Amino acid sequence: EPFSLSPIKDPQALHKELCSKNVIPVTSTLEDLLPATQAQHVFIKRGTFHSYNWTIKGRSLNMDRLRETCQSLVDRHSILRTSFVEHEGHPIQLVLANLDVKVREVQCWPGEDPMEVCKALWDGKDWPTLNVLGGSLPVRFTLVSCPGNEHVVLTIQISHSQWDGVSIPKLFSDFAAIYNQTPLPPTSDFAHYLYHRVSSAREDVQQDPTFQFWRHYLDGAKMAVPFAQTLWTFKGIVPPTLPSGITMATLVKAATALFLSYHLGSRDVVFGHTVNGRNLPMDNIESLLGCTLNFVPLRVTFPEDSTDWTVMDLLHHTQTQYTRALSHEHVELRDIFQHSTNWPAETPLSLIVQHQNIDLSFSLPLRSLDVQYSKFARFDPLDEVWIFTEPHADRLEVQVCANSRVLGQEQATELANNISAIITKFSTDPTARLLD
């Protein structure tokens, strides 16, 4: 039932206004209009914007078919033809149809490296002039070719409000299938995910099991702020061995909790963590393209007398504190805080842990063509600190990302070291008691 969640009375008038200011194409139509999620907004406010770059080499490359593939990819996934705008201070998404995709094309000079041209456009104008909330479509394609068309760089630019780690590989595998003329199953779009969430909510909010769950879960809890240019700090360790029945994510979150326990002077800690948002009974929820991520509270409570708690006890507790929330992790954070706590609704999370148990390497198997992946990325946190953990084959990488005014280099380095050290200690001796 399109437009049924629109917060605006004449959605078609908004579209017409945007067309007349040449922000979106005049021959497009408005297929739907919905609120943007809080998570989409988190990314938009932090300028989160990517260029996924595919260097393609070989004599059989077909430029027309690349162009048409871009068009077909956008026809298939409606998030890719979504525009974002503010109304009464709140972000909405306009889903366009009849959208003609125009590829930006560069024919280089002989000897000019196509990738250096992409980099120059990226740093010179593409991200510095980015204004997603002005309503111009964030998803755009660029094709940069050497003379001969045997060395080409294809670029997809995109806002993080339009993808997540589970679904981005599907964008690349769909692109390849369409280029190759391989068949594709039907899919849903991000709008269908938003309609599904709303249909599962109860009209009386005090009778919603989800807000009842969060109320109990957070009862008596306090959310402390562990910390007051954007910096990235990295630290690798040997991949931890997992105690029986414990996931890597649990290990990382327990380590973080132990650290915070000490850093604050608290036995009861609450911090944020990233969940995938796809544990819902809806068709194609595993494959639909969009940003279903959510950042929600995780609470870890050490006993008042922890003398006997082992590392295992902490791991099982931490893991249960995640699994208890699985059926309820999909709701807006400001709704959790408004309906299930005394806390102000716009209370921000100040620490967020993301474990990256998703694809870390990507492919675009176009049919003989050599195809390499690389990317450009912007991401600028506000007052929060992010801890990312990447599980590679040879190492577990701990990454801290925060503004330098919140966490200076030496402080960030020490944070990465401590979390790493604790993870390793937990791994090498899970039967140990927390008095290490």
Partner: protein, 75 residues
């Protein structure tokens, strides 16, 4: 240990696709996490469950990690 119910069979096929392991190697006593699954695999398994007419969520896979036990609680 042999697959005995229809639910066990359908579930094994799901694990095979999600974990990219061959169907012949899956026994009813197999543990999802010991065969290499994590939370995201569990999410995909749950979704494929629904498309096959079974009904379980990710939490069910953490509570009942063994195939035969998970096949009982699916509806």
């Amino acid at each position: 240990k042999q697959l005995s119910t229809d639910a066990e069979r359908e579930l094994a096929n799901i694990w095979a696709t999600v974990l990219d392991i061959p169907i012949g190697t899956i026994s009813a006593s197999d543990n999802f996490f010991f065969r290499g699954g994590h939370s995201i695999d569990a999410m995909k398994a749950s979704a494929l469950g629904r498309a096959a007419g079974m009904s379980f969520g990710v939490a069910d896979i953490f509570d009942h990690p063994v195939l035969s036990e998970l096949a009982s609680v699916a509806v």
